[PDB]
């Protein structure tokens, strides 16, 4: 039995980033860049107006002038030179005609006459005012995005600015998922027979892998039969998947075949971890027959321990495979809203609902946590709405309300319900 | 011109939750529940062993006993009664045979004899030990999920436990997106002609709407022509979409038709907001010809102001339409890593890269922020990697390094890179 910190280190040491692929612009969203992106031209590529108004010769100053051209886009004002004593109408983003060196916004002007157009400039402007010089936002050949950067909406915007519609990125791993047990029935079952339960772990894990943006290979329910589980694992290993997730069949039962089958097919690095909830967790590396590596997690059958192990061990593995330079989850410090008894031997991953408060109890703003209640590993209601795992050390003492603890954030911090 | 707080309030007051729909189990992920979910049977539905070991009569105590049955699943041990002086083998999750009232884990036992099986119980156990009574995790008819609850992986697990494979939920709004401008070209363009730029806002907004899990209707580039924009808007309004996003054509230019076209098709609630970056932002409610409501955001053309307006005003609108009871973004308090000059008139949404530190500068853990640099509205590089918008009030003073500010978190807090 090893501590969770050592188990993570082993997983990180074994897990390798996947080979990069070439995807389309919208397929690149969520993925980590596998190449630098340089701007092929400047932004703006032409001197552009910041305002709707008039392009002027700044040294002319206030006065009445003829409007010699209008410039909004493309070739507007091409070949026209704004000389001292003249102006040109411009819209925001419009190219500045040759000779003009500043822009006066329309609110600082007044149109004069009926009908040949004439305008009164009402202020004294300075050279360069309200003009974006060539490349002031992005210089030609500047690096706008770099390898290792995760692509979000503004990064998609930067790729489109630079005219990149096919992107080199690290792909997401493909994950196979199966459940084990003679007691299981499909979640479509109505009336349950004696000694039956609905398979809940498979759909839970399929959903958790979908939240990580990975393709899922659903291998269904496998019975407690060594030859049948071996066949499904052999098929999963040769199918092309990167990660295999099983649940159940890893405790001390006489028909728990996951651990010995993974020892036979590949290298098992550990099978037991010092933690609450649970204990059994097999991690193995299998080489598929040529040729590639497949990572296997023999997750515990108890629903809570199954999901807690996914959150702590599988999520950073998916991220590492997908090329994330920072795969660790966000850890914050927070205050307890109620007392919690820690375990004397096992450090706990206590499920909690956390929120940011203007006063965390100590007079200053901060995160606070409420327990989800009874933490029994068979009680999936303890995972309901839980957005964090409080890391409670094995002191055996009662941590009182108001004391501070470390907490792992497990669900999108930007989707957090406010206080 | 109105403050951002009033503009949000108007948007919230106009925005209505969409009619609920019935979806499949995996389509329900990410969606808000539109009905309560009750367990049709208890969990476990039979008295279940917590351990791999032996089901005993607790009052027998340590001694040697015959193993009268084996119970792992279904009908194992049906009709067998464990009487005082006998035991039954059990695996974790196995049904407890009639008559047994406790379980002794296999580590507290020893198999005796060769071959009729016999086992030595090594401890004195207490009635009920290591048995999950019927319904101890979930009681029959208990409410496991309620209306207004967002479905994550554990909620999918709870639906599968309860045998629910078709779920009533609030759907995501469908969003139409278009760009405006005679200066625009597609992001596939190579060499740009004079007075041209690649359309970056459309792909940026498509990606931002994909991050919010909404279907996108891409309406392309529309030119600065009143009749053409009217036709595209009329087609978008009658297409069945819930939200229309345009960008550009909302400043003071003589060919900026978005605002007057939205005034003509529906009700414009506001067109100008006191904020940095930007100023123009049109919000309108259109009634489609029978019949349903369509919300329109005339977003600014400047890339930064376009995305900032999406993050602050469009994201909570999508969430409200999708039935979120808490659509507001997460706001935290944090310390500045460097000095920042606030504006004298406009409150700023200053882009920043934030992270949680063990020491935020004041000796206690907390969030800290670095500016993304120059905040010019034309500079999309100021949005690069920005996971927060610092809310800097309009005091005109220099906020020094180490001072505290409010910050809006705009990208998945659980995807935050650690310090
Ligand atoms: N789709 C777009 N992508 C990039 N820049 C844009 C887009 N639409 C408008 N702009 C720019 O944003 C500024 C304001 O646009 P407008 O309100 O149409 O004058 C101008 O500098 C435009 O060139
Ligand atoms: N797919 C599953 N869904 C729900 N419960 C499970 C699943 N697989 C195993 N279990 C339960 O988890 C516990 C441990 O499983 P095992 O390691 O196979 O003994 C038992 O109580 C099982 O009935
Ligand atoms: Cl436990
Ligand atoms: Cl601005
Ligand atoms: Mg089992
Ligand atoms: Mg325009």
UniProtKB/Swiss-Prot annotation, chains A, B:
Pathway the protein contributes to: Cofactor biosynthesis; molybdopterin biosynthesis
Enzyme superclass (EC): transferase
GO biological process, one term: auxin-activated signaling pathway
Superkingdom of origin organism: Eukaryota
EC number, UniProt record: 2.10.1.1, 2.7.7.75
Keyword Plastid: no
Catalytic activity entry: adenylyl-molybdopterin + molybdate = Mo-molybdopterin + AMP + H(+); molybdopterin + ATP + H(+) = adenylyl-molybdopterin + diphosphate
Function: Catalyzes two steps in the biosynthesis of the molybdenum cofactor. In the first step, molybdopterin is adenylated. Subsequently, molybdate is inserted into adenylated molybdopterin and AMP is released.
UniProt name for this protein: Molybdopterin biosynthesis protein CNX1
Gene: CNX1
């Amino acid at each position: 039995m090893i501590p969770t910190e050592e188990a993570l280190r082993i997983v990180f040491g074994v897990s390798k980033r996947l080979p990069p692929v070439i995807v389309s612009l919208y397929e690149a969203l969520g993925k980590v860049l596998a190449e630098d992106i340089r701007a092929p031209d400047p932004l703006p590529p032409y001197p552009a107006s910041v305002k709707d108004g008039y392009a002027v010769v700044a040294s002319d100053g206030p006065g009445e002038y003829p409007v010699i051209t209008e410039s909004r886009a493309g070739n507007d004002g091409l070949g026209v030179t704004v000389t001292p004593g003249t102006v040109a109408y411009v819209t925001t983003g419009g190219p500045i005609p040759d000779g003009a060196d500043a822009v006066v916004q329309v609110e600082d002007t007044k149109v004069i006459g009926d009908v040949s157009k004439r305008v009164k400039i009402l202020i004294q402007t300075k050279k360069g005012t309200d003009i974006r010089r060539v490349g002031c936002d992005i210089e030609k050949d500047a690096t706008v995005l770099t390898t290792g950067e995760r692509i979000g909406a503004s990064e998609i915007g930067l790729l489109a600015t630079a005219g990149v519609t096919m992107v080199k990125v690290y792909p997401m791993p493909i994950v196979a998922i199966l459940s084990t047990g003679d007691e299981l029935v499909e979640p479509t079952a109505g009336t349950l027979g004696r000694g039956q339960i609905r398979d809940s772990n498979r759909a839970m894990l399929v959903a958790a892998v979908m939240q990580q943006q990975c393709k899922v290979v659903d291998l269904g329910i496998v019975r407690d039969d060594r030859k049948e589980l071996e066949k499904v694992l052999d098929e999963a290993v040769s199918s092309g998947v990167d990660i295999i997730l099983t649940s159940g069949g890893v405790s001390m039962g006489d028909r728990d075949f996951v651990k010995p089958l993974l020892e036979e097919k590949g290298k098992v690095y550990f099978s037991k971890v010092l933690m609450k909830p649970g204990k059994p967790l097999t991690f193995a590396e299998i080489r598929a027959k040529p040729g590639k590596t497949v990572l296997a997690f023999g997750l515990p059958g108890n629903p809570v321990a199954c999901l807690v192990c996914f959150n702590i061990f599988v999520v950073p593995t998916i991220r590492q495979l997908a090329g994330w330079t920072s795969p660790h989850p966000l850890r914050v410090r927070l205050r307890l809203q109620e007392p919690i008894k820690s375990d004397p031997i096992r450090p706990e991953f206590h499920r909690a609902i956390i929120k940011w408060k203007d006063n965390d109890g100590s007079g200053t703003p901060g995160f606070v946590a409420e327990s989800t209640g009874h933490q029994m590993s068979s009680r999936l209601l303890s995972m309901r709405s839980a957005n964090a795992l409080l890391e409670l050390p094995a002191t055996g003492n009662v941590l009182s309300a108001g004391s501070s603890v470390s907490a792992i954030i497990v669900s999108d911090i930007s989707a957090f319900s406010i206080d």
